[PDB]
């Protein structure tokens, strides 16, 4: 009775939210951008091929200097590369082989990794002795670590397979904030450029917008049919894109509280593992399970071009802060730099 | 330039050389060691099988290292993960084998049907299509006790058991009852129906009747892993 009442209340509240979102849908984004010129044909080429990972690369993160990058493979190595010269700067052996995520601190002083050991480990790259050693182990999660992103040197937001996200204080090692509300495994997170909010995509086919200081979910976005593997903010912070196992990418607006565009094709029936934007946000780059990456017109939903240099599944994608290069990692143990 | 740029490039090529020298040794250790994923339910007997390998030689994953005939094996057991496994199972694609332990006596209402559904999902997953499964139908003593007691019937939970007959290629143990043998090979053929239907994959299934305390479980793993790697080697020499 009471539980039934609560269900019917939540159902009429979902109908109120759906009608309020439909009241703002005066005209679509494709109708707005139907009279702008198209980007043409983007023909990016492979400039570098980083080699040296024994096993499949799960995750890659660009540093803020747009030159050094970190890559995590399941052989137990973190490799920090120098993408200009293809030299290797660091090779960190991990305690747990089964890593699933890596992150580069914006200061370049730290890297983080985690995976099936349910721990986020912080490695200090600027030690006094010069060797790379583990600085902190964050062990509060009860599921696999799927994504982590530094806010600064002392803060990091993690997403986990225990349906929760967390905000950590690295100096004390404790969870300062727990972000609860997702029902499925949270697969990816993306910080806003001001780092006051972040979005998280999960296996409940939903993305949530979270306030970092308040610790509450502000908005919930739906529209994807299956598990969301990837999420990335638009450069101005007022939109974000998602990649899911329903073979579609979707653009959601924060202020309109709904989806603006679907990036899909009938020849694609494979899931998206990673998404990223270009510097102006005009191009949406998505990595796919059929070993290719697609470059989409983010304003017209046209497929601008194909990055087709990998033999196994493309697992991670990153665009530099200056917008010069795209890095794609894959399950064939290779990182490729394109432009 | 040559003032500082040459010195920096020299230092970064020497650091890349020292890293590649460490990664050749790590490539040899990676290639020599064989990795196994141990899967099973909470009452399948897998914990006893780990304790049995550990006597001879909350965390998100547990590791057991054992050596057979100077061949190193690392077996990974999953703990403190949720029961939703469609994401993290994709990490185990590259392992030599998945050791799937099933309590065969548990024919929840039907733990054997749940193990068959989990085996079907593992077998037909798009990322695990080249990963071989070593299948341990465990607790053959409890299965023999329940079959010879005659209280619980397999025909209630598996109605096609009544039309089942023991295969002519069966090799029963000496002194084993024929009803126990027919129940063993029906439980084995339920998994082998799944394993022998899915095409376009480089996976093989190796079923074994086992009890948790068998000394020879590790040898059963070794002889299966020796065949899996052999098949992989043969792939290098394939023509068409």
């Amino acid at each position: 009775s009471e539980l039934d009442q609560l269900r019917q209340e939540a159902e009429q509240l979902k109908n109120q939210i759906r009608d309020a979102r439909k009241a703002c849908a005066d005209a679509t984004l494709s109708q707005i951008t139907n009279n702008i010129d198209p980007v043409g044909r983007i023909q990016m080429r492979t400039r570098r091929t980083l080699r040296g990972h024994l096993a499949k690369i799960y995750a890659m993160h660009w540093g803020t200097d747009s030159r050094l990058l970190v890559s995590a493979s399941q052989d137990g190595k973190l490799i920090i590369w120098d993408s200009y010269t293809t030299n290797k700067v660091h090779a960190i052996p991990l305690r747990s082989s089964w890593v699933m995520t890596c992150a580069y601190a914006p200061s370049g002083n730290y890297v983080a990794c985690g995976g099936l050991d349910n721990i986020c480990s912080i490695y200090n790259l600027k030690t006094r002795e010069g060797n790379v050693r583990v600085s902190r182990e964050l062990a509060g999660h009860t599921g696999y670590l799927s994504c982590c992103r530094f806010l600064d040197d002392n803060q990091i937001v993690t997403s986990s397979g225990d349906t929760t996200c967390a905000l950590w204080d690295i100096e004390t090692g404790q969870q300062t904030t727990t972000f609860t509300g997702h029902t499925g495994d949270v697969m990816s997170l993306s910080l806003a450029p001001d780092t006051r909010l972040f979005v998280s995509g999960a296996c409940d086919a939903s993305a949530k917008l979270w306030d970092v200081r308040e610790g509450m979910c502000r908005q919930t976005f739906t529209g994807h049919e299956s598990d969301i593997n990837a999420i990335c903010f638009f450069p101005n912070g007022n939109a974000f894109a998602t990649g899911s196992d329903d073979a579609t990418c979707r653009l959601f607006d924060l202020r309109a509280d709904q989806e603006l565009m679907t990036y899909s094709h009938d020849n694609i029936i494979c899931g998206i593992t990673s998404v990223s934007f270009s510097k102006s946000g005009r191009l949406l780059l998505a990595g796919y399970d059929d070993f290719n990456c697609n470059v989409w017109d983010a304003l017209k939903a046209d497929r601008a071009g194909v990055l087709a240099g990998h033999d196994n599944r493309v697992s991670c994608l990153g665009v530099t802060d200056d917008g010069m290069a795209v890095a794609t990692g894959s399950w064939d143990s290779f990182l490729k730099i394109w432009n | 330039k040559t003032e500082d740029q040459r010195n920096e490039e020299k230092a970064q090529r020497e650091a890349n050389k020292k890293i590649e020298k460490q990664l050749q040794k790590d490539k040899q250790v990676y290639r020599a060691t064989h990795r196994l994923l141990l899967l099973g339910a909470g009452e399948s007997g897998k914990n006893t099988i780990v304790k049995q390998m550990r006597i001879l030689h909350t965390s998100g994953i547990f590791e057991t290292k054992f050596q057979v005939d100077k061949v190193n094996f690392h077996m990974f057991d999953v703990g403190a993960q949720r029961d939703e496994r469609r994401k993290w199972i994709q990490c185990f694609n590259d392992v030599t084998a998945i050791i799937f332990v099933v309590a065969s006596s548990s024919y929840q209402t039907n733990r054997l049907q749940a193990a068959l559904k989990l085996f079907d999902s593992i077998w037909n997953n798009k990322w695990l299509r080249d990963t071989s499964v070593i299948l341990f139908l465990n607790k053959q003593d409890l299965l023999a006790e329940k079959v010879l007691a005659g209280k619980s019937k397999i025909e209630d939970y598996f109605p096609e058991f009544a039309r089942y007959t023991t295969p002519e290629d069966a090799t029963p143990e000496p002194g084993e009852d024929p009803r126990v043998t027919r129940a063993k090979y029906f439980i084995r053929d339920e998994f082998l129906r799944i394993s022998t239907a899915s095409g376009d994959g480089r996976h093989y299934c190796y079923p074994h009747f086992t009890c948790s305390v068998d000394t020879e479980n590790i040898r059963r793993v070794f002889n299966d892993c020796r065949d899996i790697i052999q098949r992989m080697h043969l792939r290098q020499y394939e023509l068409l």
Partner: nanobody
Amino acid sequence: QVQLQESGGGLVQPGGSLRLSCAASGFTFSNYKMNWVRQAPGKGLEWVSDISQSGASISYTGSVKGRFTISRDNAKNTLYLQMNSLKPEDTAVYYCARCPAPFTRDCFDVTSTTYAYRGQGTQVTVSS
């Protein structure tokens, strides 16, 4: 939003029949393998039946085989389950579950405790 709504349950005498229905919205229904699972009181979730995308491949669990029939209508986005010859062991909350990814042969986690692509479930009680 992915939404699944079960209906058609209730109380029946033993030997009776029921027809359960699952109305699906928020996804392309013809791209997914569908499932029926159930949860008896005091027990865990138990898989009952599944049907493939085209309806050609159909499987049941052993205790309901010959009594339960699963079917789908892709035009109406509806999943049906005809439960003839009901026993008191069939008293359960019956859930309509969707396989998590389209165009896949495998189907993980549909009997998990907190699976997302599963409806609220309808109660079927078989008693005298």
